[PDB]
Tab-separated table of C-alpha atoms and ligand atoms in Angstrom:
chain	number	residue	atom	x	y	z
S	15	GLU	CA	31.291	11.442	-16.299
S	16	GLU	CA	31.159	12.042	-12.847
S	17	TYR	CA	32.153	15.410	-11.649
S	18	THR	CA	34.461	16.362	-8.967
S	19	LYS	CA	33.315	17.689	-5.669
S	20	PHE	CA	34.868	20.912	-4.246
S	21	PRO	CA	36.758	21.653	-2.362
S	22	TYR	CA	38.619	18.586	-3.287
S	23	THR	CA	41.996	17.400	-1.357
S	24	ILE	CA	43.981	14.399	-2.614
S	25	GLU	CA	46.552	12.658	-1.108
S	26	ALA	CA	49.770	13.074	-3.404
S	27	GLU	CA	51.085	9.920	-2.785
S	28	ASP	CA	47.887	8.657	-4.302
S	29	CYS	CA	48.738	10.389	-7.599
S	30	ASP	CA	49.053	8.959	-10.997
S	31	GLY	CA	52.902	8.114	-11.089
S	32	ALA	CA	53.736	8.571	-7.430
S	33	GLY	CA	54.087	4.721	-6.854
S	34	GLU	CA	54.210	3.526	-3.020
S	35	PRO	CA	54.194	6.525	-0.450
S	36	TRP	CA	57.289	8.037	0.625
S	37	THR	CA	58.356	8.673	4.739
S	38	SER	CA	61.376	10.762	4.076
S	39	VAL	CA	63.707	12.103	1.310
S	40	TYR	CA	65.988	8.693	1.802
S	41	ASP	CA	67.843	9.825	5.245
S	42	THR	CA	66.451	13.366	5.452
S	43	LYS	CA	62.592	13.467	7.320
S	44	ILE	CA	60.816	16.447	6.385
S	45	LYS	CA	59.903	18.362	9.788
S	46	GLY	CA	56.258	17.776	11.214
S	47	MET	CA	53.606	15.170	10.241
S	48	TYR	CA	52.608	14.267	6.836
S	49	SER	CA	48.926	13.263	5.990
S	50	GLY	CA	47.964	9.538	5.248
S	51	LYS	CA	50.734	7.158	4.518
S	52	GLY	CA	53.238	9.311	3.185
S	53	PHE	CA	53.936	11.789	0.376
S	54	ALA	CA	54.657	11.943	-2.971
S	55	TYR	CA	58.480	12.570	-3.522
S	56	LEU	CA	58.615	14.180	-7.254
S	57	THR	CA	62.174	13.809	-8.812
S	58	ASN	CA	62.297	13.234	-12.720
S	59	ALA	CA	58.993	12.132	-13.521
S	60	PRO	CA	55.420	13.639	-13.426
S	61	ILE	CA	52.544	13.155	-11.057
S	62	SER	CA	49.117	13.700	-11.787
S	63	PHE	CA	44.775	13.323	-10.945
S	64	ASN	CA	42.219	14.056	-12.614
S	65	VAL	CA	39.645	17.014	-12.117
S	66	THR	CA	36.171	16.716	-14.249
S	67	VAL	CA	33.698	19.750	-14.274
S	68	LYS	CA	30.629	20.872	-15.987
S	69	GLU	CA	31.583	24.233	-17.367
S	70	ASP	CA	34.797	26.362	-17.994
S	71	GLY	CA	35.788	28.170	-14.745
S	72	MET	CA	38.812	29.102	-12.498
S	73	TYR	CA	39.969	27.197	-9.620
S	74	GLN	CA	42.539	27.863	-6.946
S	75	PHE	CA	45.245	25.248	-6.482
S	76	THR	CA	47.118	24.602	-3.267
S	77	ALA	CA	49.281	21.748	-1.837
S	78	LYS	CA	50.891	21.034	1.522
S	79	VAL	CA	54.542	21.123	0.107
S	80	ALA	CA	58.142	20.654	1.289
S	81	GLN	CA	61.370	21.215	-0.551
S	82	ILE	CA	64.761	20.797	0.708
S	83	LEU	CA	66.978	20.369	-2.538
S	84	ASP	CA	67.978	24.035	-2.783
S	85	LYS	CA	68.162	26.229	0.222
S	86	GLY	CA	67.613	29.328	-2.635
S	87	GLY	CA	64.579	28.102	-3.630
S	88	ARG	CA	63.697	25.945	-6.325
S	89	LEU	CA	61.549	25.986	-9.926
S	90	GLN	CA	58.380	24.325	-9.929
S	91	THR	CA	55.725	23.545	-12.530
S	92	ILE	CA	51.897	22.796	-12.060
S	93	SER	CA	50.143	21.998	-15.372
S	94	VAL	CA	46.814	21.731	-16.130
S	95	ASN	CA	46.258	19.623	-19.670
S	96	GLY	CA	48.951	21.115	-21.767
S	97	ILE	CA	49.205	24.294	-20.233
S	98	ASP	CA	52.072	24.851	-17.712
S	99	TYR	CA	52.581	27.298	-15.033
S	100	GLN	CA	55.716	27.865	-13.060
S	101	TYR	CA	56.158	28.520	-9.408
S	102	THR	CA	59.226	29.071	-7.545
S	103	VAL	CA	59.293	27.099	-4.108
S	104	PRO	CA	61.213	28.103	-1.507
S	105	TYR	CA	63.591	25.728	1.085
S	106	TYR	CA	60.582	24.394	3.009
S	107	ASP	CA	61.904	21.640	5.487
S	108	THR	CA	58.691	21.387	7.166
S	109	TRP	CA	55.229	20.936	5.521
S	110	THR	CA	54.308	23.918	4.436
S	111	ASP	CA	51.166	25.166	2.402
S	112	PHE	CA	52.121	26.474	-0.827
S	113	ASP	CA	49.908	28.656	-3.089
S	114	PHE	CA	50.118	27.547	-7.101
S	115	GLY	CA	47.629	30.089	-8.633
S	116	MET	CA	44.112	30.235	-10.022
S	117	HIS	CA	44.087	28.466	-13.365
S	118	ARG	CA	41.385	27.392	-15.483
S	119	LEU	CA	39.936	24.174	-15.734
S	120	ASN	CA	37.910	23.078	-19.189
S	121	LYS	CA	34.752	21.522	-19.690
S	122	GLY	CA	35.139	17.683	-19.009
S	123	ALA	CA	38.258	15.884	-17.795
S	124	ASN	CA	41.305	17.723	-16.805
S	125	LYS	CA	44.711	16.161	-16.052
S	126	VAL	CA	46.450	18.362	-13.292
S	127	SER	CA	50.254	17.332	-13.140
S	128	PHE	CA	53.273	18.537	-11.279
S	129	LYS	CA	56.048	17.956	-13.994
S	130	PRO	CA	59.728	17.470	-12.972
S	131	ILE	CA	60.607	21.065	-14.069
S	132	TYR	CA	62.610	21.151	-11.875
S	133	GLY	CA	60.805	18.543	-9.626
S	134	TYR	CA	62.659	17.245	-6.465
S	135	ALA	CA	60.345	18.569	-4.166
S	136	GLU	CA	57.717	16.969	-1.857
S	137	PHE	CA	54.143	16.722	-1.677
S	138	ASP	CA	52.047	15.434	1.099
S	139	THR	CA	48.404	16.687	-0.042
S	140	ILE	CA	46.709	18.811	-2.939
S	141	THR	CA	43.899	20.484	-2.948
S	142	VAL	CA	41.557	21.966	-5.473
S	143	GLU	CA	39.014	25.015	-4.756
S	144	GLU	CA	36.853	26.900	-6.738
S	145	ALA	CA	38.838	30.137	-7.280
S	146	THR	CA	38.173	33.174	-4.866
S	147	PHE	CA	38.996	36.729	-6.960
S	148	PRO	CA	40.362	40.136	-5.630
S	149	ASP	CA	37.703	42.436	-4.818
S	150	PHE	CA	38.375	44.799	-7.388
S	151	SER	CA	35.586	47.454	-6.344
S	152	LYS	CA	37.282	47.880	-3.008
S	153	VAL	CA	40.389	49.300	-4.829
S	154	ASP	CA	40.945	52.551	-3.393
S	155	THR	CA	41.292	55.327	-6.172
S	156	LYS	CA	42.371	58.307	-4.681
S	157	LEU	CA	45.166	60.023	-6.830
S	158	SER	CA	48.415	60.137	-5.725
S	159	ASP	CA	48.631	64.107	-6.656
S	160	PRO	CA	46.872	65.345	-3.367
S	161	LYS	CA	45.867	68.478	-5.536
S	162	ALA	CA	44.102	66.672	-8.318
S	163	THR	CA	41.781	68.210	-10.094
S	164	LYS	CA	38.152	67.253	-9.715
S	165	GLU	CA	37.872	66.380	-13.622
S	166	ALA	CA	40.851	63.868	-13.155
S	167	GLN	CA	39.657	62.411	-9.692
S	168	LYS	CA	36.180	62.143	-10.997
S	169	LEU	CA	37.615	60.244	-14.451
S	170	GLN	CA	39.968	57.673	-12.021
S	171	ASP	CA	36.972	57.250	-9.778
S	172	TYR	CA	34.636	56.210	-12.672
S	173	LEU	CA	37.427	54.010	-13.741
S	174	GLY	CA	37.121	52.224	-10.411
S	175	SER	CA	33.507	51.678	-10.724
S	176	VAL	CA	33.854	49.370	-14.025
S	177	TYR	CA	37.394	47.717	-12.716
S	178	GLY	CA	36.609	44.226	-12.530
S	179	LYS	CA	33.139	44.394	-14.384
S	180	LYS	CA	34.109	45.459	-17.408
S	181	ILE	CA	36.771	46.466	-20.079
S	182	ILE	CA	37.084	49.479	-21.727
S	183	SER	CA	37.318	49.813	-25.075
S	184	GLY	CA	40.365	51.879	-26.533
S	185	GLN	CA	42.500	52.861	-29.833
S	186	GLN	CA	45.887	54.486	-30.618
S	187	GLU	CA	45.714	57.225	-33.509
S	188	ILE	CA	48.217	57.758	-35.655
S	189	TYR	CA	51.602	59.604	-35.676
S	190	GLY	CA	51.457	63.348	-36.480
S	191	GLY	CA	51.000	63.919	-39.966
S	192	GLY	CA	50.225	60.124	-40.621
S	193	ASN	CA	47.409	58.749	-42.993
S	194	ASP	CA	48.114	61.598	-45.185
S	195	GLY	CA	46.385	63.728	-42.242
S	196	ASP	CA	43.420	61.839	-41.710
S	197	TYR	CA	43.866	60.878	-37.898
S	198	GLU	CA	40.279	59.436	-37.965
S	199	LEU	CA	40.789	56.492	-40.327
S	200	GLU	CA	41.504	53.548	-37.459
S	201	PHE	CA	38.743	55.048	-35.870
S	202	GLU	CA	35.967	55.325	-38.568
S	203	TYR	CA	37.524	51.641	-39.164
S	204	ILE	CA	35.988	50.318	-36.009
S	205	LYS	CA	32.764	51.928	-36.152
S	206	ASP	CA	31.741	51.091	-39.534
S	207	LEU	CA	32.974	47.199	-38.704
S	208	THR	CA	31.473	47.434	-35.226
S	209	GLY	CA	28.694	50.021	-34.947
S	210	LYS	CA	30.637	51.063	-32.348
S	211	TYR	CA	33.576	53.662	-31.485
S	212	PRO	CA	36.379	53.106	-28.797
S	213	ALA	CA	35.549	54.874	-25.467
S	214	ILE	CA	39.686	56.001	-25.040
S	215	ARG	CA	41.441	57.503	-27.626
S	216	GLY	CA	45.462	57.142	-27.430
S	217	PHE	CA	47.483	60.350	-28.353
S	218	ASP	CA	51.189	61.321	-28.197
S	219	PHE	CA	53.077	64.478	-27.725
S	220	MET	CA	56.423	63.566	-29.129
S	221	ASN	CA	56.189	66.038	-31.574
S	222	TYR	CA	55.957	68.986	-29.313
S	223	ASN	CA	60.210	68.788	-28.958
S	224	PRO	CA	63.155	71.165	-28.831
S	225	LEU	CA	64.590	69.119	-31.679
S	226	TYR	CA	62.181	69.644	-34.718
S	227	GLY	CA	59.239	70.288	-33.067
S	228	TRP	CA	55.878	71.647	-34.467
S	229	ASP	CA	52.386	71.504	-34.173
S	230	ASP	CA	50.383	68.153	-35.244
S	231	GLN	CA	47.060	69.448	-33.324
S	232	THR	CA	47.292	66.610	-30.917
S	233	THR	CA	45.857	68.918	-28.186
S	234	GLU	CA	43.423	70.225	-30.147
S	235	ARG	CA	41.904	66.791	-30.961
S	236	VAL	CA	42.538	65.664	-27.422
S	237	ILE	CA	40.140	68.495	-26.591
S	238	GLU	CA	37.648	67.304	-29.193
S	239	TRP	CA	37.789	63.958	-28.029
S	240	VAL	CA	37.072	64.740	-24.558
S	241	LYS	CA	35.048	67.702	-24.435
S	242	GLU	CA	32.712	67.322	-27.547
S	243	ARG	CA	32.607	63.508	-27.808
S	244	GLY	CA	32.778	62.666	-24.228
S	245	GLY	CA	35.649	60.354	-24.673
S	246	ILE	CA	38.430	59.378	-22.379
S	247	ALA	CA	41.939	60.232	-23.484
S	248	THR	CA	45.330	58.626	-22.855
S	249	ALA	CA	48.796	59.522	-24.229
S	250	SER	CA	51.960	58.343	-24.225
S	251	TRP	CA	55.422	60.791	-24.857
S	252	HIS	CA	58.081	59.285	-27.780
S	253	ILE	CA	60.260	62.379	-26.581
S	254	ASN	CA	63.573	61.826	-28.797
S	255	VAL	CA	67.014	62.846	-28.109
S	256	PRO	CA	69.819	63.450	-30.686
S	257	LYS	CA	71.857	60.662	-31.591
S	258	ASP	CA	75.047	62.393	-31.693
S	259	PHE	CA	74.856	64.373	-28.336
S	260	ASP	CA	78.406	65.437	-28.256
S	261	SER	CA	78.114	67.840	-30.906
S	262	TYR	CA	74.797	68.859	-29.823
S	263	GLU	CA	74.116	72.611	-28.530
S	264	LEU	CA	70.800	73.792	-26.942
S	265	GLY	CA	68.883	75.450	-29.623
S	266	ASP	CA	70.360	73.425	-32.610
S	267	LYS	CA	67.522	72.189	-35.089
S	268	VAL	CA	68.216	68.525	-35.573
S	269	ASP	CA	66.206	66.748	-38.287
S	270	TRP	CA	64.323	63.728	-36.559
S	271	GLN	CA	66.086	61.540	-38.696
S	272	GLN	CA	69.409	62.203	-36.675
S	273	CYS	CA	66.886	61.809	-33.522
S	274	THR	CA	66.286	58.591	-31.331
S	275	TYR	CA	64.286	57.401	-28.564
S	276	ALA	CA	66.169	54.343	-28.607
S	277	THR	CA	69.384	53.157	-27.128
S	278	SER	CA	71.839	54.186	-29.880
S	279	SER	CA	72.556	57.827	-28.448
S	280	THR	CA	75.359	59.242	-26.662
S	281	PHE	CA	73.025	60.839	-24.548
S	282	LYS	CA	73.950	60.011	-20.894
S	283	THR	CA	70.761	58.878	-19.703
S	284	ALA	CA	72.051	58.836	-15.978
S	285	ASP	CA	72.692	62.405	-16.442
S	286	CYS	CA	69.312	64.002	-17.531
S	287	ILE	CA	68.428	64.318	-13.605
S	288	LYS	CA	71.671	65.689	-12.804
S	289	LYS	CA	72.117	69.649	-12.548
S	290	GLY	CA	74.636	71.839	-14.649
S	291	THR	CA	74.630	69.088	-17.225
S	292	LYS	CA	73.511	69.318	-21.077
S	293	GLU	CA	71.156	66.340	-20.724
S	294	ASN	CA	69.530	67.842	-17.985
S	295	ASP	CA	69.476	71.241	-19.907
S	296	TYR	CA	67.618	69.392	-22.778
S	297	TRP	CA	65.508	67.375	-20.660
S	298	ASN	CA	64.334	70.263	-19.116
S	299	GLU	CA	63.424	71.703	-22.136
S	300	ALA	CA	61.589	68.825	-23.534
S	301	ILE	CA	59.830	68.791	-20.056
S	302	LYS	CA	58.812	72.674	-20.932
S	303	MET	CA	57.357	71.832	-24.003
S	304	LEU	CA	55.197	69.002	-22.897
S	305	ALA	CA	53.756	71.227	-19.796
S	306	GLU	CA	53.133	73.803	-22.186
S	307	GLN	CA	50.742	71.217	-23.926
S	308	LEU	CA	49.295	69.850	-20.438
S	309	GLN	CA	48.753	73.054	-19.339
S	310	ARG	CA	46.370	73.919	-22.196
S	311	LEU	CA	44.575	70.870	-21.420
S	312	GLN	CA	44.221	71.682	-17.482
S	313	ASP	CA	42.871	75.403	-18.669
S	314	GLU	CA	40.063	73.557	-20.538
S	315	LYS	CA	39.705	71.106	-17.821
S	316	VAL	CA	40.527	68.117	-19.591
S	317	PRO	CA	42.078	65.180	-17.690
S	318	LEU	CA	44.348	62.556	-19.231
S	319	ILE	CA	45.658	58.970	-18.591
S	320	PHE	CA	49.503	60.076	-18.704
S	321	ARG	CA	51.870	57.334	-20.028
S	322	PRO	CA	55.254	58.978	-20.012
S	323	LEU	CA	58.440	56.826	-19.838
S	324	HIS	CA	56.850	53.860	-21.055
S	325	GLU	CA	57.752	50.253	-21.661
S	326	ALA	CA	61.135	51.041	-19.462
S	327	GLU	CA	62.482	47.592	-18.641
S	328	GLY	CA	61.996	46.478	-21.997
S	329	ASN	CA	63.756	42.704	-22.440
S	330	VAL	CA	64.289	41.441	-18.942
S	331	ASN	CA	66.832	43.277	-17.030
S	332	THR	CA	67.643	45.749	-13.775
S	333	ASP	CA	71.087	46.790	-15.134
S	334	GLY	CA	69.409	48.803	-18.538
S	335	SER	CA	70.864	46.127	-20.786
S	336	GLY	CA	67.296	44.939	-22.187
S	337	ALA	CA	65.780	48.236	-22.625
S	338	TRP	CA	64.709	49.700	-25.917
S	339	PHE	CA	63.993	53.261	-24.679
S	340	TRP	CA	66.730	55.485	-23.705
S	341	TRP	CA	65.331	56.489	-20.230
S	342	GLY	CA	65.859	52.757	-19.361
S	343	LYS	CA	69.263	52.719	-20.497
S	344	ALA	CA	70.751	53.060	-17.258
S	345	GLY	CA	68.657	50.642	-15.185
S	346	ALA	CA	65.860	50.043	-13.098
S	347	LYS	CA	67.186	52.370	-10.193
S	348	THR	CA	68.220	55.449	-12.598
S	349	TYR	CA	64.755	55.214	-14.442
S	350	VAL	CA	62.476	55.210	-11.064
S	351	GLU	CA	64.814	58.563	-10.459
S	352	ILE	CA	63.701	60.048	-13.826
S	353	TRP	CA	60.132	58.938	-13.143
S	354	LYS	CA	59.970	60.864	-9.889
S	355	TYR	CA	61.944	63.811	-11.514
S	356	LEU	CA	59.104	64.264	-14.024
S	357	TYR	CA	56.525	63.723	-11.652
S	358	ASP	CA	58.008	66.055	-9.116
S	359	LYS	CA	58.725	68.467	-12.311
S	360	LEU	CA	55.113	68.558	-13.792
S	361	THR	CA	53.158	68.572	-10.275
S	362	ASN	CA	54.993	70.894	-7.999
S	363	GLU	CA	57.024	73.475	-10.950
S	364	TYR	CA	54.797	73.309	-13.469
S	365	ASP	CA	51.514	73.040	-11.113
S	366	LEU	CA	49.943	70.397	-13.350
S	367	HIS	CA	47.270	67.952	-11.575
S	368	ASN	CA	44.872	66.819	-14.414
S	369	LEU	CA	47.070	64.117	-14.933
S	370	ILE	CA	46.266	60.116	-14.027
S	371	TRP	CA	50.041	58.859	-14.316
S	372	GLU	CA	50.094	55.216	-15.560
S	373	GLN	CA	53.253	53.423	-15.436
S	374	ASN	CA	54.448	50.508	-17.440
S	375	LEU	CA	55.183	47.396	-16.008
S	376	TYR	CA	56.485	44.106	-17.221
S	377	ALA	CA	56.313	40.600	-15.438
S	378	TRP	CA	59.122	38.681	-16.934
S	379	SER	CA	60.428	37.923	-13.553
S	380	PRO	CA	60.096	39.376	-9.662
S	381	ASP	CA	62.812	41.786	-10.543
S	382	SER	CA	60.537	43.536	-12.766
S	383	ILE	CA	59.023	45.263	-9.885
S	384	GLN	CA	62.065	47.328	-9.290
S	385	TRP	CA	60.887	49.087	-12.083
S	386	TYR	CA	58.194	50.429	-10.264
S	387	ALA	CA	58.227	54.235	-9.211
S	388	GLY	CA	55.939	53.549	-5.866
S	389	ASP	CA	52.729	53.780	-4.884
S	390	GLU	CA	52.907	57.622	-4.195
S	391	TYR	CA	53.931	58.164	-8.046
S	392	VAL	CA	51.988	55.955	-9.916
S	393	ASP	CA	47.906	55.793	-10.185
S	394	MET	CA	47.778	52.892	-12.922
S	395	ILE	CA	49.717	50.088	-14.438
S	396	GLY	CA	50.008	49.420	-18.123
S	397	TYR	CA	50.979	46.315	-19.742
S	398	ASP	CA	51.749	46.371	-23.311
S	399	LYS	CA	51.080	43.281	-24.779
S	400	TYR	CA	52.632	42.253	-28.020
S	401	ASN	CA	52.435	38.184	-28.399
S	402	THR	CA	51.537	37.533	-31.761
S	403	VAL	CA	55.007	37.331	-32.975
S	404	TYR	CA	57.447	37.012	-29.710
S	405	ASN	CA	56.087	36.313	-26.369
S	406	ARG	CA	53.727	33.958	-28.125
S	407	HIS	CA	52.411	30.871	-25.942
S	408	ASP	CA	48.474	30.246	-27.329
S	409	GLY	CA	49.807	27.208	-29.220
S	410	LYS	CA	50.041	28.997	-32.699
S	411	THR	CA	52.686	30.885	-34.875
S	412	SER	CA	50.600	33.118	-36.913
S	413	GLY	CA	47.657	35.412	-36.757
S	414	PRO	CA	45.479	36.525	-33.615
S	415	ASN	CA	46.297	35.707	-30.456
S	416	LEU	CA	43.329	35.618	-28.210
S	417	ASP	CA	44.977	34.553	-24.950
S	418	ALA	CA	43.876	36.697	-21.876
S	419	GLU	CA	47.411	36.642	-20.427
S	420	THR	CA	45.737	36.158	-17.216
S	421	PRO	CA	49.037	35.211	-15.144
S	422	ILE	CA	50.563	38.564	-16.702
S	423	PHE	CA	47.661	40.115	-14.963
S	424	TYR	CA	47.795	38.705	-11.726
S	425	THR	CA	51.420	38.807	-11.275
S	426	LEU	CA	51.027	42.483	-11.955
S	427	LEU	CA	48.411	43.029	-9.372
S	428	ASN	CA	50.348	41.366	-6.741
S	429	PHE	CA	53.447	43.260	-7.920
S	430	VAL	CA	51.500	46.089	-6.405
S	431	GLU	CA	49.269	44.450	-3.742
S	432	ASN	CA	46.232	45.283	-5.939
S	433	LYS	CA	46.301	48.954	-4.902
S	434	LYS	CA	46.690	50.133	-8.553
S	435	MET	CA	44.355	49.383	-11.256
S	436	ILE	CA	46.005	47.291	-14.564
S	437	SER	CA	45.138	47.695	-17.923
S	438	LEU	CA	46.127	46.817	-21.436
S	439	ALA	CA	47.928	49.971	-21.964
S	440	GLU	CA	48.952	48.625	-25.982
S	441	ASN	CA	48.329	45.628	-27.669
S	442	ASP	CA	48.675	44.079	-31.131
S	443	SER	CA	45.894	41.002	-30.594
S	444	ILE	CA	42.744	42.236	-28.243
S	445	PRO	CA	42.171	39.242	-26.189
S	446	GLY	CA	39.057	36.931	-26.975
S	447	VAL	CA	36.220	38.431	-24.529
S	448	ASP	CA	35.053	34.862	-23.563
S	449	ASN	CA	38.802	34.708	-22.520
S	450	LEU	CA	38.501	37.587	-20.452
S	451	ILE	CA	35.331	36.808	-18.803
S	452	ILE	CA	35.777	33.346	-18.057
S	453	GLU	CA	39.291	33.918	-16.599
S	454	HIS	CA	38.755	37.179	-14.782
S	455	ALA	CA	41.206	38.633	-16.690
S	456	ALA	CA	40.217	41.965	-15.250
S	457	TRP	CA	42.285	44.324	-17.411
S	458	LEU	CA	40.814	47.679	-17.018
S	459	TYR	CA	41.075	48.735	-20.894
S	460	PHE	CA	42.699	47.427	-24.234
S	461	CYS	CA	44.181	49.604	-26.692
S	462	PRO	CA	45.536	48.451	-30.110
S	463	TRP	CA	48.527	50.427	-31.755
S	464	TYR	CA	47.674	52.675	-34.887
S	465	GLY	CA	48.178	51.085	-38.295
S	466	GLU	CA	47.960	47.180	-38.832
S	467	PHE	CA	47.793	46.092	-35.266
S	468	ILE	CA	44.003	47.472	-35.824
S	469	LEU	CA	43.309	47.437	-39.623
S	470	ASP	CA	45.371	44.025	-40.270
S	471	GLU	CA	42.966	41.106	-39.772
S	472	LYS	CA	46.129	39.149	-38.778
S	473	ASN	CA	46.271	40.882	-35.433
S	474	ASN	CA	42.475	41.490	-35.151
S	475	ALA	CA	39.913	39.588	-36.871
S	476	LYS	CA	36.774	41.044	-37.726
S	477	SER	CA	34.287	38.695	-35.829
S	478	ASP	CA	36.479	39.015	-32.782
S	479	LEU	CA	36.123	42.851	-32.962
S	480	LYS	CA	32.737	42.677	-33.714
S	481	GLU	CA	32.086	40.488	-31.289
S	482	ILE	CA	34.084	42.259	-28.211
S	483	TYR	CA	32.753	45.629	-29.265
S	484	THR	CA	29.318	44.479	-29.092
S	485	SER	CA	29.756	42.701	-25.937
S	486	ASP	CA	28.048	43.847	-22.988
S	487	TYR	CA	31.542	42.975	-20.860
S	488	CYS	CA	32.677	46.193	-23.252
S	489	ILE	CA	32.662	49.911	-22.449
S	490	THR	CA	32.689	51.730	-25.934
S	491	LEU	CA	31.904	55.640	-26.232
S	492	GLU	CA	28.195	55.288	-25.958
S	493	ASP	CA	28.542	53.951	-22.684
S	494	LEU	CA	30.388	56.681	-20.865
S	495	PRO	CA	28.758	59.117	-18.497
S	496	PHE	CA	30.639	62.126	-20.123
S	497	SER	CA	28.537	64.833	-22.085
S	498	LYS	CA	29.164	64.880	-26.080
A	525	LIG	CA1	50.357	12.371	2.171
């Protein structure tokens, strides 16, 4: 088995399945000059070549291409053995270098193919190089809030210091009242199994609301985690609205069964940021009760990775039709305005500056970036990865999905042009630690949801949990600098 020498360039016309070299797309010449005797015209049948490597590794794929069938661009597919990666190649009437991404080559032979999905593009040469990765250490971690507290900025800088070098362990605690009051169940499970505690603990402020609000002691547990155990805190905010908002009046007691965070309410999402509306009055009351708790944290000098208004896009859309939370119901543009509203309200009116603002993004399409509030309003990008049931592409149907989802990571990275750190804010399965390292899927941290998502081996196997939690690549509670 002779091993490929890098950089490796082939004439595409020499690929398996290419046949005799082309010199024009029938009557239409590609402008410029092709290398060699001509080019490969990929129509409805694949072209391919082999690369052999000694070990698993990441490699950069580039090709000198043209594409003259579709003025608006045409989907193309590069494939490594059995795995497909999709790229949209713009209209190119002249030979142009195109970046077909960095992908994993595995030990031994690798069939690299361009598949007819959707084909009808021209290939002059193809080049394979050893991958080069973004400089994660050079990401500027100055917080977007100019008045950010010293604790918040120091936390963000610590995160930046391990970004690309490690992944930080995390775990969401149970909803208020859950586990018959035992909020430590999930955490003691991890400890007894792996010998480690997660470094990051996930919370939620949903029960501090104007409808059925009570005191589930979240704020105290956040303080306990950070100030007494030396951990890192993150928190979401599943703030509900009344289902029947027409009959609702401010101050009404509404049972949680008659509330929702979904898209089934008569609550007009777009109006929550419009002065003089009941939507706005309720939204402001909810923000007030939230800010009250966040202020307590700021008072006790506790920084927080705050992830409000999360999973905004939901399923692929920009008009709101795919969202499953009410704040995304009115579309991307309205959603971003709502995010900015909350950001401005908390930082200016409530003078809160202890927050690291994490916004969820998805990677369904390029339009997914329309749900991004911008560099000046966001400190971190979160991805919620549930791929054990839907969106599963690891070749399995059931059980743990150990896929690193590396393409999702780099899609999100390029969205923000590597100006924000990216994490797995939520997941079912934690990716395999070997997949994370080999593929350089530099997710800042991971965080299974509560209940079955950590406790059930169909989501996370015990052997995998022990392996990643005791891995040098994974930061656990003991590894943190902060005082316990
Ligand atoms: Ca050629």
